[PDB]
């Protein structure tokens, strides 16, 4: 009655009341109720583990509805109704059912000896985590949302030392057994289920970036390297010879070139790079018609730049019903405004039609000369943002990632320490050199330069021993006290937090994969024809059926049986080595002691 | 059960005769039974007995007689 | 005379305070074009834009390149020509702090922290 | 404020040292028993 | 045994805070006819209580008389 869970149930039987919702009746807690709360406490997945539908609508048994006859919110299958249902006999996850239960009580002790019998050990484990994170964080505000987030980092390593267990033997099994779809568990293929439990520590190790590293760089290999994919890539011709190293070429499956271009194309490396490019060069288009191309009227490369902006704004309608909830189109776009660079798109966007308006109009091309070189740099972030790529600059640049706030924070700080004493130097000095917009000049755009180089000796320099003496007083606090102590809080919350950004930028790799791995490889200057080749398919279709380009790897009956026994046996093999680690720990083998002297001092009273 | 799943089991062979058997009307089979049900009853036990659920391998010898004791020791 | 200058350094691999010292650059050497493509990258960006907002009329058959790129990096290491470099001279104060700041501070001090810290 | 006093007593208990105090008392308490023959 | 008896009142202030903050800061605040009033927030800063003053709750109800009525979460 004290748990959060009972209080969440306890609320759900009146959110659905008898009277307006479940309309006979529902005072009594049955199965559909528990489904509907659990499908709250995951994420926005199918159908929880307990039938929804009319044949098991659990909602509306107190009242006389209707047998076999009705199968109509009510009993359509099942034997009686007798103010029940009948046997279900197992509904396919009986193990599962109690760990459920036992982990939404926050029983620790009695929630382990479940989870040993499990049958779908690592995808358990992994819903188990997430239950318990999302949990811990609704409300009992001490106490035991931090032993649950305990208990939810203890499934958390169980479910890692499994995997590190069936990975060891047989990896492209393992791989295999990774991606698959769980029937046991309203799929939740564990790649996608252990995403939203942000799973810090799972993501990170070992296999799980090697698959991460196998669906990217799709079918050429693992071992070719980076600068010397991007020369073939140009070169078409290049592809052709023996440089690269492809899957196809040591199964001499090459029967058509085109076909295994396609298969190179296809990857996601190449379309990252493609777009990368094609990103690198409009850039340079759009400094092509600043410099010579500074007309008031659409010239022969401007009508470009529109049908850029047209294919790339695009993209995001396509991200729109890429993978929505079929009834929120307004909750779906919360979490693009939840991500402030795509904000920072949003208003780069907003930028260019701010600018636009002073660029077709001509009595403002001076304005409009100034408003847009900022935009050239607004892009630059965003070009920024995608490379969150490599090994070396990946968790390096999720190090100035937490330097962002704090970038605001020293400019403002060390452009109040300029302007302090760039007031200062033209004081003493009678300075006579004034304009309209140039006395500033002389003012104050000359102590900046006076910073790093622009020191005019001949003008800067009676008060000369001042002068000395004021100079070394800056450069003592700014080279001195602004520049090294700067290192001591960049390396040391370096060391601080390097862990946490090797992992979280582990964790945000299959972000960038998962973009760019559903996508064809179809170039941004082509891709508008991508974007109307599923709307002209809509004029044939009417339905949301055309493919699932997902992981979400879906497996036979006669594999799935052959895994999951393949499974159960490394995990009670990983049962063994816990079992043995907590046996073979100095502080335990203190506890053996001390129990067994305690059976001495009662077996020497005999006498 | 004790072991935790450990590599290995202590085998045991059990021989018992096959006349002395509650429900072995069950056991019979025509044909190949690789799959087959025997359940356990200690209520109807009247000369016979029924068999134990632990040992891994079984070997039944029959004589022709029913309640007879001792048709197992020889062989 | 440079490629002739790496392999003499090669042949450094001797002194007890170098030779370990070396061997650190040795783990620098594909980084070493890392942050060279790294940095000139950053360098570029605002090259580029250095000479955007200013009308600069110096040109000649590849020596506008000179007055366009080459003056970029000299305004980087003290070759700054203030009587040409400097109405918009806010934003010039804004954008000259702005590059600045992620290099001398996020781009010069946080390779001491990648440097010390993979050295221990 | 005595729930807190539960959590440093049970912690002291809990201190792998000390353990080492309550094995070292109850073996002086062997000598002594086995001396009545 | 001063900073013993420093660890000591922290543990106490850390089990109190944990239930219900709000009450523990409202305890944190009042006065003690029994010693001379010296509230207890007043009574830690002369002794200058490096451990006591920077531990959780403490500064938390510094952030809260400080932004008085307005929130702890604006920017």
Known sequence: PSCLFHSKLQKVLVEDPERPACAPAAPRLQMHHVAQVLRELLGDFTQPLYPRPRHNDRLRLLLPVPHVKLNVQGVSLRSLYKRSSGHVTFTMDPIRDLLIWAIVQNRRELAGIIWAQSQDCIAAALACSKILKELSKEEEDTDSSEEMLALAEEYEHRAIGVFTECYRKDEERAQKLL??????????????????????????????????????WGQLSVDNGLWRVTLCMLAFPLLLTGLISFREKRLQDVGTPAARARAFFTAPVVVFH??????????????????????????????????????????????LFYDPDECGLMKKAALYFSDFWNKLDVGAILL???????????????????????????????????????????????????????????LFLLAVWVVSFGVAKQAILIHNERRVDWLF????????????????????????????????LYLLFTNILLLNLLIAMFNYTFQQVQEHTDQIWKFQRHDLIEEYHGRPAAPPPFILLSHLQLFIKRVVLKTPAKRHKQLKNKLEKNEEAALLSWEIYLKENYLQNRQFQQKQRPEQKIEDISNKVDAMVDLLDLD | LSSS???????????????????????????????????????????????????????????GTHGQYGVEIPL
């Open chain 1, 274 to 319: 493609l777009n990368i490019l094609s990103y690198f060069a409009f850039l340079c288009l759009f400094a092509y018609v600043l410099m010579v191309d500074f007309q008031p009227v659409p010239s022969w490369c401007e009508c470009a730049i529109y049908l850029w902006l047209f294919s790339l704004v695009c993209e995001e309608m396509r991200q």
């Open chain 1, 441 to 472: 000049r002389g003012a104050v755009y000359h102590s900046y330069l006076t910073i790093f180089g622009q020191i005019p000796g001949y003008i800067d320099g009676f008060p000369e021993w001042l002068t000395v003496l004021l100079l070394c």
């Open chain 1, 179 to 216: 991606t698959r779809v769980s029937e046991a568990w309203g799929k939740t293929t564990c790649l996608q289920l252990a995403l939203e439990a942000k799973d810090m520590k799972f993501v990170s190790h070992g296999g799980i970036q090697a698959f991460l590293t196998k669906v990217w």
């Open chain 1, 352 to 410: 260019f039609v701010a600018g636009l308006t002073c660029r077709l109009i001509p009595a403002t091309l001076y304005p409009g000369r100034v408003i847009l070189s900022l935009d050239f740099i607004l892009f630059c972030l965003r070009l920024m943002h995608i490379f969150t790529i490599s090994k070396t600059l990946g968790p390096k640049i999720i190090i100035v990632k937490r330097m962002m706030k704090d970038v605001f924070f020293f």
């Open chain 2, 5 to 63: 799943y450990k590599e290995g089991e202590l085998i045991t062979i059990g021989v018992a005769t096959w006349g002395t058997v509650h429900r072995r009307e069950g056991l019979i089979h025509p044909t190949g039974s690789f799959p087959a049900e025997y359940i356990l009853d200690e209520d109807g036990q009247g000369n016979l007995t029924c068999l134990d659920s632990n040992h891994s391998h079984f070997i039944l010898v029959d004589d």
